[PDB]
């Protein structure tokens, strides 16, 4: 009944080979199947360029260490495979690049993954306007209760609730607070706001991933003469903002045009952030 | 390099067939592989009996609803398959029963699983003394930051940290607090203590699974004339206890013989809890 083939053209490097489709890799006795030992990252190729691909390949390795896995591939080898893999596509569509590590076996206790049982795959697949935000009744976890250190599948079912409950109320996404009440990020990306020409973004506090796109954008805007401030923000701050915009979602910078009931224009600083990213990425 | 076959004899029912080994089921484009959409439960067959098997089959379905999956099999059908599957083994060893549901695809957003893409497997495998506990520096998450509602793989990497850090200090396991500072459970089971003939256990607060074994044991001890109290416990309470014991780990009731530096005898109430469980299970 359930069709498991991919929704778009897909090529995956695993165990020395490039495979089309959705080839099964993990079984019912694989530790990753029931006990959560998986880690991934994401980058985007479009028009012969892959912005910060190198940083995404380093991160998937740090994610793996952080979740108790042992990264088998150097970041350079992962980059290398990505450039080879991209040639198997016609190039007329953007390609998402998803490296993954996972565990096959537990250790002295079945719950703790055996780092020597780590396996790797690199999955490349073709890719399938202002958005609206509300406030989520859900929260980010903390480093004390989850490994927020890792870009890991185990964190994402909370994002699935966040996004679905926001959609049930007519929004595309939602802002998500940490356990202190401060805004951390959205259900799927980092968040920025602008007030009186100044750019603000939630300070990195280990409840959320301080993104690679976030870091690039902050650096670009600084070098263009903006004030960019990492701080603690609340909902009140966002209700008062001149512009709001997101970063992530495979290296994109996207405007937010509705916050709760209030409409906003897509703003100038946001456009500038987009033009700087592009000029940097094409240089 | 990594051998993915199972560490013991294994039979899995999936897509209408019984399969030996660790047959691959999930691929790199399967939602469950990177975004955490998996759920399982566990029961134990030994000597022709499977204690509360029916309740574990109902729970895996509730877990599935709670994580946004759509349970495809009635609890009765799952029980039915378990009794058929057990006949493929020689019967000289205990058999663990692990039903699983997972997602194959996302929906309007890739992060949120499509409930119609849910698949099922039932994995049966053969099974491969007082223990020691410390206090964990980690915490349980809350229902506001994770779906603690579901027996889901995404929760378990936190248990992997808990167990490993306890082992790094010379213990088998650790007590784990909720975010209010009260003891919730251990890294792998529910916890009980006895003080002056009275049995105490942490009250169910949606930060941890109130077990099926826990509930059985509480009911058995009540019916045998014990006082059994669900309350808020702290570490101080446990440091003062006459006995401590655990429940879970596939329907077992096990004594704790060390708490930090303090040694304890395996105690009478714990033995009684074990004899009651057995007499109930064999009736």
Q: Tell me if the domain spanning B1-129 has CATH number 3.20.20.80.
A: no
- Between CA A158 and CA A141 the distance in angstroms is 9
Distance from CA of A156 to the nearest CA of B (A): 6
- Domains A1-129 and A130-283 belong to one CATH topology: no
The 3-state secondary structure of chain B, one letter per residue: CCCCCCCCCEEEEECCEEEECCCCCECCCCHHHHHCCEEECCEEEECCECCCHHHHHHHHHHHHHHCCCCCCCCHHHHHHHHHHHHCCCCCCCCEEEEEEEEECCECCCCCCECHHHEEEEEEEEECCCCEEEEEEEEECCCCCCCCCCCCEHHHHHHHHHHHHHHHHCCCCEEEEECCCCCEEEECCEEEEEEECCEEEEECCCCCCCCCHHHHHHHHHHHHCCCCEEEECECHHHHHCCCEEEEEECCCEEEEEEEECCEECCCCHHHHHHHHHHHHHHHC
Q: What backbone torsions phi and psi does residue A233 show, to the nearest 5 degrees?
A: -115, 150
* Half-sphere exposure for A243 (CA within 13 Å, toward CB): 22
Provide the 3-class DSSP secondary structure of residue A220: helix
Identify which of B22, B153, B155 has the shortest CB distance to residue A27. B22
Interface test with B, best of A111, A157, A189 (most B CBs within 10 A): A157
Across the interface, whether the CB atoms of A111 and B23 are under 8 A apart is answered: no
- C-alpha distances out from residue B245 to A173, B82, B110, B194, B211, Å: 45, 29, 43, 9, 14
Yes or no: say if A281 and A275 are a contact pair by the CB < 8 Å rule.
no
Q: Which helix (H) or strand (E) holds A168?
A: helix A156-168
- Between CA B175 and CA B282 the distance in angstroms is 31
Using a CB-CB cut-off of 8 Å, the residues of chain B touching A33 are 25-26, 32, 38, 100, 102, 153
Using a CB-CB cut-off of 8 Å, the residues of chain B touching A12 are 27-29
Instruction: Map out the domains of chain A as residue ranges.
Output: 1-129, 130-283
Tokens matching residue A61: 């390795």
Please name the method used to determine this structure: X-ray
Tokens matching residue A232: 């603690």
End-to-end, the C-alpha distance of chain B in Å comes to 48
- C-alpha distances out from residue A22 to A250, B6, B48, B70, B117, Å: 21, 23, 40, 22, 14
- Between CA A183 and CA A232 the distance in angstroms is 7
Task: Name the nearest CA neighbour of A202 among A160, A156, A244.
Answer: A244
- Between CA B233 and CA B177 the distance in angstroms is 9
Q: Which helix (H) or strand (E) holds A228?
A: strand A228-231
Using a CB-CB cut-off of 8 Å, the residues of chain B touching A137 are 144
Across the interface, whether the CB atoms of B146 and A145 are under 8 A apart is answered: yes
Provide the 3-class DSSP secondary structure of residue A49: strand
- C-alpha distances out from residue A135 to A23, A174, A175, A273, Å: 39, 5, 5, 24
- Between CA B271 and CA B251 the distance in angstroms is 15
- Between CA B102 and CA A216 the distance in angstroms is 36
Interface test with A, best of B132, B157, B249 (most A CBs within 10 A): B157
Mode of pairing for the β-strands spanning A189-195 and A243-248:
antiparallel
Q: What is the DSSP letter of A204?
A: P
Task: Name the nearest CA neighbour of B143 among B206, B69, B62, B59.
Answer: B206
Identify which of A40, A145, A163 has the shortest CB distance to residue B141. A145
Render the burial of A174-195: b for 16+ CB within 10 Å, e for the rest: bbbbbbeebbbbbbbbbbbbbe
Number of helices (H), then strands (E), belonging to chain A: the values are 7, 15
| A141 → chain B, closest CA residue | B145
Across the interface, whether the CB atoms of B36 and A108 are under 8 A apart is answered: no
Yes or no: say if B244 and B259 are a contact pair by the CB < 8 Å rule.
yes
Annotation: CATH topology of A130-283: D-amino Acid Aminotransferase; Chain A, domain 2 (3.20.10)
Across the interface, whether the CB atoms of A6 and B29 are under 8 A apart is answered: yes
- Between CA A113 and CA A90 the distance in angstroms is 39
- Between CA B141 and CA B163 the distance in angstroms is 16
| B100 → chain A, closest CA residue | A34
Provide the 3-class DSSP secondary structure of residue A275: helix
Identify which of A14, A22, A29 has the shortest CB distance to residue B30. A22
Across the interface, whether the CB atoms of A25 and B23 are under 8 A apart is answered: no
Yes or no: say if B136 and B259 are a contact pair by the CB < 8 Å rule.
no
- Between CA B207 and CA B179 the distance in angstroms is 9
Yes or no: say if B136 and B176 are a contact pair by the CB < 8 Å rule.
yes
Provide the 3-class DSSP secondary structure of residue A203: coil
Mode of pairing for the β-strands spanning B38-40 and B43-45:
unpaired
Yes or no: say if A270 and A257 are a contact pair by the CB < 8 Å rule.
no
Across the interface, whether the CB atoms of B29 and A10 are under 8 A apart is answered: yes
Maximum CA extent, chain A: 57
- Between CA B204 and CA B218 the distance in angstroms is 13
- Between CA A203 and CA A218 the distance in angstroms is 12
Distance from CA of B229 to the nearest CA of A (A): 27
């Amino acid at each position: 009944a359930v069709d498991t083939s991919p929704r778009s053209t897909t090529w995956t490097f695993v165990d020395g080979e490039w495979l089309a489709g959705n080839p099964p890799l993990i079984g019912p006795t694989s530790h990753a199947m029931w006990l959560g030992s998986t880690v991934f990252d994401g980058a985007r190729w479009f028009d012969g360029i892959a912005p910060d691909l190198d940083l995404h390949c380093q991160r998937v390795n740090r994610s793996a260490e952080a979740l108790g896995l042992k990264p088998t591939m150097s970041a350079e080898e992962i980059e290398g495979l990505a450039w080879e893999g991209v040639k198997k596509f016609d190039g007329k569509t953007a390609i998402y690049v998803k490296p993954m590590y996972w565990g096959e076996h537990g250790s002295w206790s079945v719950v703790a993954v055996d780092p020597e049982s780590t396996r790797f795959a690199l999955c490349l697949f073709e890719a399938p306007a202002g958005s609206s935000l509300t406030l989520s009744p859900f929260r980010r976890p903390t480093l004390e209760c989850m490994p927020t250190d890792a870009k890991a599948g185990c964190l994402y079912p909370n994002n699935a609730r966040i996004l679905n409950e926001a959609r049930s109320r007519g929004f595309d996404n939602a802002l998500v607070r940490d356990m202190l009440g401060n805004i951390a990020e959205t259900g799927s990306s980092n968040i920025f706001m602008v007030k009186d020409g100044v750019v603000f973004t939630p300070a990195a506090n280990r409840t959320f991933l301080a993104g690679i796109t976030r870091s690039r954008v902050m650096g670009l805007l600084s070098e263009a003469g903006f004030e960019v401030i990492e701080t603690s923000l609340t909902m009140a701050d966002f209700e008062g903002a001149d512009e709001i915009f997101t970063s992530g979602n495979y290296s994109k910078v996207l405007p937010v045009t509705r916050l709760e009931q209030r409409e906003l224009q897509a703003g100038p600083v946001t456009a500038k952030a987009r033009d700087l990213y592009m000029d940097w990425a094409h240089a």
